[PDB]
Amino acid sequence: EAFVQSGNKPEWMILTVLPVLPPDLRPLVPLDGGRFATSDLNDLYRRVINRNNRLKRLLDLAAPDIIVRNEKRMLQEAVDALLDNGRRGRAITGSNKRPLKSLA
Amino acid sequence: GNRRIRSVGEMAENQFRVGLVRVERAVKERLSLGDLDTLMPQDMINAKPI
Amino acid sequence: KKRWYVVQAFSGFEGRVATSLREHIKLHNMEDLFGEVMVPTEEKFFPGYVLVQMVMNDASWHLVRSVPRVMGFIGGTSDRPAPISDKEVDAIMNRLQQV
Amino acid sequence: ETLRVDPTNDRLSALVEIYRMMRPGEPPTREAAESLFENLFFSEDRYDLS
């Protein structure tokens, strides 16, 4: 009753297009000139974008179904991490061995 | 009685052993791969991890 | 009957895997159960993945994962690797016949 | 009391069962189970009491 009465519609909940924060709000300070400080959100975006592109290639190539199926999950996994990075079975971490800070 | 003290020497050694374990993976594969008739130990083990 | 099966490993070190697995097979030599392990290439459909022509059994299954930095098979479950479709392989090999 | 709870009966079942728990959703194998079991508590490289 609440859902229908609201302006929301459940199908929107499944993301198809994704927003990305304005860069200044996710600054990349030059900790030491070219050796910038780590900026997790950019890193997460980097992973997703690359994960997205690679899937695109196989879709272009029409890769065998099993591979793309796995890719789809791996894409979902990255997005999952991007949001929470810990609600999933395992948080992802860099060489510093600390869990990356998700958006939430 | 249930509790014991660790000092620098003890802790360091364990840390040192951990590094060898990471050597183990590298050396074993190299040894498995190596021809072994011209390879020499300095090739088989590299300092960086330890 | 032997069929191609899908495995994933570390990119770039894929190539090391490409030959090393054969070497491991020649060490333990349950080889006749194997076919070839192959990965196409471009000037790159599969940049960090593997194809395994083989009949799948535990002994071979563990042998494949023996080589480090190989994540494992893809399929319904780890112990149930999925084969690539016959039409897929026959199509893709032609897609590999051109490079 | 435990014997009533226990579903396993033979060493095969025990080795298989424990492996399964240690290796969730993974192919069992009798010698693999044994070797894994050995690693658990009967090899310095994975279990050691000073």
Place this chain on the structure above:
RNA sequence: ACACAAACGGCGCGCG
């Protein structure tokens, strides 16, 4: 042209 200046995230130790 009448104008900016040097921190992002962790760890340890202490402080009331």
Place this chain on the structure above:
DNA sequence: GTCCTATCGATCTTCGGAAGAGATTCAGA
């Protein structure tokens, strides 16, 4: 030496704690 380049994800020193309420779940009634 300088500088370029592609993923990033397994097995090793892991476990080092614990109150409180929504699933899912053990035993029949």
Place this chain on the structure above:
DNA sequence: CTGAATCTCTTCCCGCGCGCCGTAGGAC
């Protein structure tokens, strides 16, 4: 459809002072 004995992601005073310290793999 009743029952506990099972089940896991929330939370863990407010501020301050130094010190250190941050992707991997390679044309040989």
